[PDB]
Design a protein around this ligand. Structure first.
Ligand SMILES: [Fe+2]
Length: 199
């Protein structure tokens, strides 16, 4: 249970193949890189973006930038398949006016994790985040408004779409070490797209 969250399991199953082709297309211009946190530690989750803006780490913290700091080129345009799926997901959730300008693509290798954090770099925290999972299953862990609040678990599998709105939007969250295994479309990893209204 998560207030404001609309869980649409296997919603992106049909679009999955095209999404993976489009991730590889995005990755050819802006490669997956394990971003260095402000404290000097490399993240285990490999990331990249597409859209006008893109999430990245820098010296003084976290920010959205229209430029990829590794390639020094802008982030690739958001694929049509990405726009179409996010629009369908958002509309089904009660947000037909949601128009993302940023999509953070997370790649999880076996054992890759993401510790507890909040997504608060966006200007309007009332605007939801559309999460699309592809490939190997992962355990999404979440608390509440505070970091010491009781942790709940949710498995996110291939094609699972969640629209994190309302209270759920501000929840402290993370991903547990990705269990090893096989998936027909991604081989040995998990991909996660998080559409954001960043401008
Ligand atoms: Fe997050």
């Amino acid at each position: 249970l998560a207030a404001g969250a609309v869980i649409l399991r296997r919603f992106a199953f049909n679009a999955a193949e095209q999404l993976i082709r489009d991730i590889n297309d995005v990755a050819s211009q802006s490669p997956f890189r394990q971003m260095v946190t402000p404290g000097g530690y490399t993240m285990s989750v490999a990331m990249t973006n597409c859209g006008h803006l893109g999430w990245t780490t820098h010296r003084q913290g976290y920010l959205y930038s229209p430029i990829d700091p590794q390639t020094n080129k802008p982030w690739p345009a958001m694929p049509q398949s990405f726009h179409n799926l996010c629009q369908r997901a958002a509309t089904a959730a009660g947000y037909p006016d949601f128009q993302p300008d940023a999509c953070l693509i997370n790649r999880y290798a076996p054992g890759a994790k993401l510790s507890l954090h909040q997504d608060k770099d966006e200007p309007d925290l009332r605007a939801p985040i559309v999460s699309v999972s592809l490939g190997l299953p992962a355990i999404f862990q979440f608390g509440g408004l505070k970091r010491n609040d009781p942790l709940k678990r949710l498995l996110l599998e291939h094609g699972d779409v969640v629209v994190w709105g309302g209270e759920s939007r501000l929840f402290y969250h993370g991903i547990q070490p990705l269990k090893a295994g096989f998936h027909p479309l991604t081989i040995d990893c998990r991909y996660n797209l998080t559409f954001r209204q960043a401008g």
